[PDB]
Amino acid sequence: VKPNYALKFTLAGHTKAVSSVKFSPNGEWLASSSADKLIKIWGAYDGKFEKTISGHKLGISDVAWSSDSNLLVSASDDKTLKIWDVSSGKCLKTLKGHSNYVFCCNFNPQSNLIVSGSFDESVRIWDVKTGKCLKTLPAHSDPVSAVHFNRDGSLIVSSSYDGLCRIWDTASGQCLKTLIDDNPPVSFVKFSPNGKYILAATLDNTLKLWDYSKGKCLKTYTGHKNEKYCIFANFSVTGGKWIVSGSEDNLVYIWNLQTKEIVQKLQGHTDVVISTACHPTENIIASAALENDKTIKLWKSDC
């Protein structure tokens, strides 16, 4: 069984490179962040442009939704993160503390906390309600490329250009694990929906499925191009069990999680596919491309 992802909608509006696309947990919306300093909201099923959210002084590298789908958090080159009330478009808080580009961000499941990663080499844990930085983790010795909470928010996984993936205890801020045959820059990391595995991408055209407890590599996925960009990868769980990733050859790659075989390549983009997202309940992939393309694509499969 292979998926049958076909193009349904192309979403144009950003005037500079799109950096990140994320589906709201309620499945109604898609949020996009761009180098044009804007956040855009789009209908998840019809690609219908909804609204623009502005405020950042420089471009945005990442965006994430709260669990109730009411708030967004964005990570900007302006060295801040901003918390937004989606319906009103208001900026609730400006998160200050990072001394360089804020690259990545995520809410925890309870959505009372925000995790962020920066070029300043740190991981920061923020209180949503107050906007205060609760902890600064001396995480890495190079830019932090990704940050993600596990299923119950008790763990944080971070990745960096230093070649490491680190597992952190949310409550204490203590480093619980360091994942090390070589150390190529780690451009992306995230926990599996069950929280037992971590999917990590490295700038050597390789994606790896790790078992965090045992520190063992279970699966390796290749065939795509990834040597310069921090491309988002995902676990597609609505139909068949796939690994979805963007690629520097302008394609969306889909692998069978178990066999590691490429099951689909999506053609359509005209620049690096920097970001992909999988809909929480429907077999829908959102993809986003860089400066020379500027569009977002919505693809759907029967399985």
Partner: peptide
């Protein structure tokens, strides 16, 4: 304008 949109040189 955005760090993620720039390649690792």
């Amino acid at each position: 304008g955005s760090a993620r949109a720039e390649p690792k040189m």
